[PDB]
Ligand binder design. Structure first.
Ligand SMILES: Cc1noc(C)c1-c1ccc2c(c1)nc(CCc1ccc(OCCCN(C)C)cc1)n2CCN1CCN(CC(=O)NCCOc2cccc3c2C(=O)N([C@@H]2CCC(=O)NC2=O)C3=O)CC1
Length: 126
């Protein structure tokens, strides 16, 4: 019906940090995840108005998308890698929660999540 405001990507009161693990996650996003053929539905907040999904934000109370994550990394919004990993997990589980097994969008999220999990298993030490 109306879209909510998107998740913040900067906040003057939230401590900001650059770490080698967060740099690695930014590289994973820019070099791999953002360019993936299934990235497009996840590159920006779900536009429930344009997609005619009036129930989306009744069901999804913690929205997250890869455009927000990318901007958070680019703005040094995160303090640690775990915060970014959590945002990815929120993004994928939101897709599974709103949709139904076998939906095309769920298959896309599953492939992106599997690739992301591969990259997380190669996360460097701090
Ligand atoms: C996540 C998630 N979790 O749960 C849900 C639900 C979702 C979810 C979220 C978003 C979804 C989404 C699902 N599905 C879509 C669009 C699906 C769609 C709709 C109509 C269509 O074609 C209609 C053809 C005419 N009919 C008579 C058949 C093609 C795809 N979208 C919207 C995708 N939007 C694509 C456009 N983007 C703005 C933009 O300019 N981005 C540039 C990249 O555009 C890309 C990149 C890759 C692939 C496609 C696009 C793109 O615009 N389309 C199509 C083109 C036709 C069209 O009307 N819409 C599209 O999205 C693609 O198939 C904004 C986002």
């Amino acid at each position: 019906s109306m879209n909510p405001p998107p998740p913040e990507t900067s906040n003057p009161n939230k401590p900001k940090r650059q770490t080698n693990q967060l740099q690695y996650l930014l590289r994973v996003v820019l070099k791999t995840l953002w360019k993936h053929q299934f990235a497009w539905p996840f590159q920006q907040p779900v536009d429930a108005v344009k997609l005619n999904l009036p129930d989306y934000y009744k069901i999804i109370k913690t929205p997250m998308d890869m455009g927000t994550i990318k901007k958070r990394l680019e703005n040094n919004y995160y303090w640690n890698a775990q915060e970014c990993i959590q945002d990815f997990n929120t993004m994928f589980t939101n897709c599974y929660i709103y949709n139904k097994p076998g939906d095309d969008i769920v298959l896309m999220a599953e492939a992106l999540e599997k690739l992301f999990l591969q990259k997380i298993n190669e996360l460097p030490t701090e």
